[PDB]
Paper text:
Hb is responsible for ensuring oxygen (O2) distribution in the body by binding and transporting O2 from the lungs to tissues. It carries out this function by equilibrating between the high-O2-affinity relaxed state (R-state) and the low-O2-affinity tense state (T-state). On the other hand, stabilization of the R-state and/or destabilization of the T-state leads to a decrease in the P50 (increase Hb affinity for oxygen) or shifts the OEC to the left. A number of aromatic aldehydes that bind and increase Hb affinity for oxygen have been studied by our group for their potential therapeutic application in SCD treatment. These aldehydes form Schiff base adducts with the N-terminal αVal1 amines at the α-cleft of Hb to stabilize the R-state Hb and prevent hypoxia-induced HbS polymerization.
Aromatic aldehydes are known to preferentially bind to the relaxed R2-state conformation to increase Hb affinity for oxygen. Subsequent crystallization of the deoxyHb-compound complex in test tubes using 3.2–3.6 M sulfate/phosphate precipitant pH 6.5, and ferrous citrate (50 μL) in a glovebox under nitrogen atmosphere led to formation of two different crystal forms. The crystals, corresponding to T-state and R2-state crystals were used for X-ray diffraction data collection at 100K using Rigaku MicroMax™ 007HF X-ray Generator, Eiger R 4M Detector and Oxford Cobra Cryo-system (The Woodlands, TX, USA). The T-state Hb or R2-state Hb structure showed two compounds bound at the α-cleft; the molecules forming Schiff base interactions with αVal1 amines of both α1- and α2-subunits in a symmetry-related fashion. Expectedly, the T-state Hb structure lacks oxygen at the hemes, while the R2-state Hb structure shows bound oxygen atoms at all four hemes, presumably from residual or slow diffusion of oxygen into the crystallization tube, as previously reported. Similar chemical hydrolysis of the organic molecule nitrate esters to release NO, and crystallization has been reported. The final Rfactor/Rfree of the T-state and R2-state structures are 15.1/19.1 and 18.6/22.8%, respectively.
Residue numbers in the entry:
A (entry chain A), C (entry chain C): 1 to 141
B (entry chain B), D (entry chain D): 1 to 146
Write the structure that this text describes.
């Protein structure tokens, strides 16, 4: 459950990503695949090499889904219902992997937005990503 | 922990640039801010009531230097982490009863601090190597729980 | 995130629990303190002995909180705001302990409900208790 | 793991009453129902699309017998769980890459199934002894991660 301060922090920090969405999402995925190679099992059809155009385009979809989640922060089960159906019903992603990608997203934000990535904002982004992860791992329809 | 020769070199080169007086306090402070239940273990440090109070707390900064020195010791003994952290494991497990998931949390906060400090220098391959290190440290600290 | 079927199961199962909810709350606490003795550090002034009147009185409180959450299952952050402040802001309970108590409540229900603790009911109650735990460990008030 | 001599007696006494043909399948079945991402590891087992399908699935029941047999082996060698589970640890960690949190979940589902079968006989002290066992089994299975 996010506080008003959390939502303020997440909107402020994530809004600075902007058109870096695809690059930063792709970087977070690459960090995850390199740091936690077990995650690659969910992407068998993917070219996962460093500058892969598949990963770059998928990263943009992930980042934009997060932007949508930020806009609907008070309404995430509804806004993300299709993604929950994909990740929880169809893909059956083990919840641990959401913690790995969420951590790699925080690392990516920290590496690119040092002034923005304060302890308070770090803490809010962690809760936000945890909240997204709960929706994507729940079967609620 | 098994680092490739290239990973060990990249890990060592980066760690040689770490401010030994600050990075540990930054990592410990962010643990207390991002995961506030960890504050229960550190009530003797005084005012932890807001993020600014945590990050400016001198006892947090001072203890953080000891935490960072333990990570430094791990980096110097990558092939014997369990022996290096045996006494720390008994302290954290048998005495303080820190649930071992929190070990993983501090390691990942340290990784976030390195990324924050080094920016683009904290490349995905350098992170991958540091993730192996902090996993090894957390496993070694949890060894006496088992 | 609870499905409509989860909410149906939780309301039905907690109805079957009925007037025994307070007893089961006290039994879950006793199970937690015995099985996971680190949880006793949160209750330094309690008589934690087997069958203590203090644990029986606290179990009634825990159960009444859960009954209120079942009645407000669509609105738990609002229903539980004061309990969240107590557990997350004041007591700073490690979220691992909520998984321990939730498990001990499930064990208690299994031990008392041989005719009604179906797999679907078990699954729905687990999600309910995980949702309550998230609310009580979140700082949002 | 430890277990007092009284805890050892209580554990083995209850296990002597456990149906070896069914309890393992019930625990695995409830794991697949309660934690449905675990179904990703069992696609060769057939229809898992409803709780009724899971709990009646013949492959779940047959495999569950083997899971329970592994627990029985653990109970016979409580002072060497790590060695007892060495082959299964390499299977689950190095071959299947099952995340070790799921070992703890299955152990706790087994505790729930025991409580379901034994009712008031599954006293708090009996449960506390079984929690030591299933924690020890889970840690032993995760050993190849350490
Ligand atoms: C914050 C967390 C996550 C978000 C916001 C997210 C979002 C998305 C989006 C937007 C898509 C594509 C939808 C479409 O193209 O129609 C997708 C697909 C997918 N995601 Fe995630 N995801 C997350 C976490 C994860 C994790 C942790 C894994 C596994 C390690 C995972 C595995 C997948 C897979 C396998 C696909 C399908 C890719 C394909 O075959 O096209 N996701 N996700
Ligand atoms: C990789 C993870 C960790 C490392 C390397 C580490 C390292 C250390 C070191 C070197 C000490 C000083 C020991 C001494 O003075 O003899 C210490 C003490 C302590 N640690 Fe940790 N630690 C870690 C994780 C944690 C976590 C996650 C917690 C709690 C959430 C924790 C709680 C404590 C406490 C309470 C003390 C005593 C502080 C005091 O009162 O002075 N540690 N740790
Ligand atoms: C489903 C989970 C839980 C629920 C519904 C719950 C509910 C409650 C309620 C109703 C109270 C009394 C509030 C009052 O007196 O105003 C309370 C107090 C308390 N709870 Fe929880 N609780 C839960 C989990 C936990 C856990 C896991 C812990 C720690 C292991 C914990 C530790 C405490 C403590 C220390 C108190 C204060 C006792 C006192 O000093 O009187 N609670 N909780
Ligand atoms: C924690 C206690 C567990 C025990 C004691 C256990 C025991 C076993 C045993 C005895 C086997 C058969 C090995 C053989 O015949 O060579 C097996 C196989 C297997 N286990 Fe586990 N297991 C546990 C947990 C899990 C969990 C949590 C998962 C996944 C969520 C899992 C997934 C599997 C799979 C996928 C197989 C191979 C099945 C097949 O395709 O034949 N196990 N396990
Ligand atoms: C609001 C909040 C913080 C963490 C979570 C996990 O679902 O939710
Ligand atoms: C709906 C749901 C499942 C698990 C959780 C944790 O908050 O919530």
């Amino acid at each position: 459950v996010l506080s008003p301060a959390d939502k303020t922090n997440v909107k402020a920090a994530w809004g600075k990503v902007g058109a870096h969405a695809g690059e930063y999402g792709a970087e977070a995925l690459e960090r995850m695949f390199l740091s936690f190679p077990t995650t690659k099992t969910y992407f068998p059809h993917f070219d996962l090499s460093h500058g892969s155009a598949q990963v770059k385009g998928h990263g943009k979809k992930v980042a934009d889904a997060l932007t949508n989640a930020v806009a609907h922060v008070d309404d995430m089960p509804n806004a993300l219902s299709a993604l929950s159906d994909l990740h929880a019903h169809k893909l059956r992603v083990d919840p641990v992997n959401f913690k790995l990608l969420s951590h790699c997203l925080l690392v990516t934000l920290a590496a690119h937005l040092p002034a923005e990535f304060t302890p308070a904002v770090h803490a809010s982004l962690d809760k936000f990503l945890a909240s997204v992860s709960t929706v994507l791992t729940s079967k609620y329809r | 922990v098994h680092l490739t020769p290239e990973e060990k070199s990249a890990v060592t080169a980066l760690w040689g640039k770490v401010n030994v007086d600050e990075v540990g306090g930054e990592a410990l402070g962010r643990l207390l801010v991002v995961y506030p239940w960890t504050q229960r273990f550190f009530e003797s440090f005084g005012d932890l009531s807001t993020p600014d109070a945590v990050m400016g707390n001198p006892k947090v900064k001072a203890h953080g230097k000891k935490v960072l020195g333990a990570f430094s010791d791990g980096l110097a003994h990558l092939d014997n982490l369990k022996g290096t952290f045996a006494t720390l494991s008994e302290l954290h497990c048998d005495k303080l009863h820190v649930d071992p998931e929190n070990f993983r949390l501090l390691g990942n906060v340290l990784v976030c601090v390195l990324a924050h400090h080094f920016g683009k220098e904290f490349t995905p391959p350098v992170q991958a190597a540091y993730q192996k290190v902090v996993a090894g440290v957390a496993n070694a600290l949890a060894h006496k729980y088992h």
